[PDB]
RNA sequence: CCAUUAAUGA
RNA sequence: GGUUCGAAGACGAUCAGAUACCGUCGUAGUUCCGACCAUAAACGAUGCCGACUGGCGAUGCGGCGGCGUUAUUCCCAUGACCCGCCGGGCAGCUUCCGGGAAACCAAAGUCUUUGGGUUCCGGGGGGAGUAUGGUUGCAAAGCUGAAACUUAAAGGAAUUGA
């Protein structure tokens, strides 16, 4: 990642970043998220620097691969945008998913049935998953967060500045992170593109599901 | 912590944060050892050796954790110098 | 202290000399009004003459008729 | 009688693949099982009850008195704790206080005053601790002095093994719960104060969760 | 107004150490401040610093580490002999192992162990540990 | 006031979760089915459980139920998750590019690209909701 | 104890305002402390608009209004149920009630 | 009420001043 | 619209 | 000079009683000028000056920079809007910086790891802001200001019932 020709930024990755809209940040501005924005556009929407986004994705991929056991890595999403993304990420990696209904106390209450003592937390949204930050304040749990330009950095541990609102952008960044950790650990080589299509990770509107069911038959 | 003879006499030696240069107490239950992996320059895969880092709880509850991790990784050579 | 100068010793001494009088024990020890109003006169014992014997009703919850002597 | 493990650290204790609680205090792992300290330091561990405090709340059918137990716990070498538990009966209150005390013991620090020959005896520097308005200050003392203190924190320091210490108290020290928690916070911050003898860099050893990560998934879920 | 420039600068670096900044800009530059910073340098509590010397009250940038617990000040400049310095380090320093009380003398601005070596008392300035 | 309690409802959910194939739509059939599969000591509680089973089966025929784990609905959920659509909306011949994004891409390594389309900037800086 | 940050009123740097008499009582209230209702009022609301729309001379004549800025005190506002007491966690929520009806 | 206690004491002070001024 | 007061100790 | 309102006072109601709340009046007063007194829950119950320590959306002042809309239309430039920046002015929102007994406080923080400089003021509650002495004032009153004696409580924050 540091002056390495292998871990550079790819032209197709630039095309998919521009097609998803991950650089298109939020309207407001956070005081901690100032060092990941190059220039403010017209209409008051910030530009997330895609190269520094790729660098923070590489560092979070280092943090994922450095954990030896993939089974005790909890990947969390409470909004409806990221549930299918974290479920298919856990199915592709070996992680443990949370897709809605995060019970407060799964990291602190032992008598509960869904008690886990993990080694790594990967957070979709900080304001939606502020409660795993509160359990990670008491259990020694590192935090990976897909932050926005407005998302604060309270109790997080490493962050990737992205657009946490667009359903294409969130799933595209989960796809980039999943392909990066599969290229790092000894499963999939870096020469060929990955076979499973990145539209698998996108959450579908049920109106779009009914429209596709109408258009299929 | 050595005595007149020179023996290590304290019953443990505490951890120290690599960002604020401050030790970590016994019930500082938010201190995290970050592990950064390594990538070979000719293969591009995981090697086996790590880079360890300490984060105390005050930096987490303040909000300067990932900035300190980014600065330590840029100093140790993980993040590129362009950034 | 409040003022922390290098030569405020007379100010601190005069302020503490004026504020010792607001203590109850210092005033009772260093004014002669309480020593004059003390029937013993700063003494421990005193002889006197019995003139009458008074039954004094007691205070709050504990009630009795105590036996005092006007000396 | 046979203890069934629940936590991962408790499973490591039942596997005996960690040599002491020193690595647990190094990596700051939360101890949430009361049998771990009975396993490690349970031979010389001592329980002494400080005060049974009868707190109560007012209901519509009079008052409801429930007893609050304070237990000072610890062997005479380096590790003590203070446990607080309020329950309906005093026996269950003292038992729960001993359990929470075993969950929340802390390591205490002993150092030298001036000459550094022999074993460490005193608190190495002027430290302090407070909760509420009770302020307890711990002062280094020379050799042969003793624990010049009130009887309850003198009992706590006699448990802690600090032979020589001067103390200072500020506030309404009649509240023995806040008084014991204030001296508990002082002896906990002894191992939190930055000592200039700790200028050596910390070579971080491997966590036991990362050491035995294969046994922890092959012997149970 | 600004009465004690040394006390203001040391309270500034004390606030910087309490928050956790890597470096801080204290706004004036005095000779007592520069000599105090060199004493903390030679005793190894802070890093190496620099001063910005315009033709006014200059500025000072000090690279800070976590080895400085609290940097205080003793105002005003009390006289300290060799008979009372034991009581000074008894009621001001945290221990007799570390911590140094600076005090200016005619031989130079120095701390209490160097004052015991050179056998010379003087006016106290502050403490640092 | 005809409201079922938790001892009816949780037991009926366990019955439908474990024996979904044996249960049906008719009340007088799945009542006897629940009688044979579950030991219910009273006819009134048996009728309450059977009625709540019929009402949950009506909810299943109307749509999905949250507090249930049916194997067929789980297989349908897994199929709808593993469904692969047609070619992506990320692969487009025309991608709208803002001028400041074009400037930062020029400052990066890939400055000139193949299938990008730079657009005009939104003139008029009016993007905030008025106050009050 | 100090119950409100702005102490029961809307003064922070003024210090003194002019008094206004109440409408229900004749209580002398400070201007920024008084509960103010800018009551809009169509002179007929439901019943007589149907009568005026057929008894008026001009075709499609718009009905007039009557604007009154009422000033109440704390006692008059709570006795006429303009404002109510709230929980201490909901005291700081100074959003106005909406215009749903 | 402290206000009427102060006003009662002012009237009592006026009575004391009048009874001293009579002498 | 009017509505005053519940003797001391436990 | 007295329009309105309205201490004292009169009258009519309610009440066992009203020498109050309610209503009709109504003197002094409330309005202006020349002389008094210096008292307020005169409060932000938080003295004045100086340095440091999170941001966020504003607003007011003056200045600066930059797409554009709109008037002097006949351009530049000045007025009105939009986005920022600069110094403090009243402020507001979040909060494990930190403090406090807590309510709360970006100060009520930089406090047992106690020292930036400086004026006033408190030493349990009553007696009591009382007596006396001095002083100011036409008076009412204001400033300084006790003691004897009496009591083990008085008080502040917060919790649960009623």
Author numbering:
A (entry chain q): 2 to 218
B (entry chain HH): 1 to 83
C (entry chain VV): 2 to 72
D (entry chain v): 58 to 278
E (entry chain TT): 2 to 130
F (entry chain YY): 2 to 133
G (entry chain ZZ): 2 to 102
H (entry chain n): 2 to 24
What does the paper say about this structure?
XBP1u has two hydrophobic domains, HR1 and HR2, and a C-terminal AP of about 26 residues which pauses the translating ribosome when residing in the ribosomal exit tunnel. During this temporary pause in translation, HR2 is exposed outside the ribosome exit tunnel and can recruit the signal recognition particle (SRP). As a result, the paused XBP1u ribosome-nascent-chain mRNA complex (XBP1u-RNC) is targeted to the Sec61 protein-conducting channel on the ER membrane, where mRNA splicing by IRE1α is now possible. We show that the XBP1u AP makes extensive contacts with ribosomal tunnel components and forms a unique turn in close proximity to PTC in the ribosomal exit tunnel.
We structurally characterized the paused ribosomal complex (XBP1u-RNC) by cryo-EM and single particle analysis using a mutant version of XBP1u (S255A, full length numbering), which was shown previously to pause ribosomes more efficiently than wildtype XBP1u. Processing of the cryo-EM dataset yielded a total of 531,952 ribosomal particles, and multiple rounds of in silico sorting for homogenous populations resulted in ~60% of programmed ribosomes, with the major population of ribosomes in the non-rotated state (~42%, P- and E- site tRNA) and a minor population in the rotated, not yet fully translocated state (~18%, A/P- and P/E- site tRNA). In both states we observed strong density for the XBP1u chain, which was connected to tRNA and extended down the ribosomal exit tunnel. The average resolutions of the paused complexes were 3.0 Å for the post state and 3.1 Å for the rotated hybrid state, respectively, with the ribosomal core reaching a resolution of 2.5 Å. A major portion of the XBP1u peptide in the exit tunnel was resolved to between 3.0–3.5 Å for both classes, whereas the resolution in the part distal to the PTC near the exit was worse than 4 Å, apparently due to flexibility of the nascent chain. In both states, we observed that the ribosomes are paused with Met260 connected to the tRNA in the P-site, in full agreement with findings from ribosome-profiling analysis of mouse embryonic cells. In the following sections, we will refer to the post-state paused RNC complex for further analysis and discussion, since the nascent chain conformation is indistinguishable in both states. Since we detect a substantial fraction of the RNCs in the rotated state we cannot exclude that the XBP1u structure may also perturb translocation as well as preventing rapid A-site tRNA accommodation. However, we do not observe any perturbation of the P-tRNA 3'-CCA end pairing with the P-loop in 28S rRNA, as was seen in other cases.
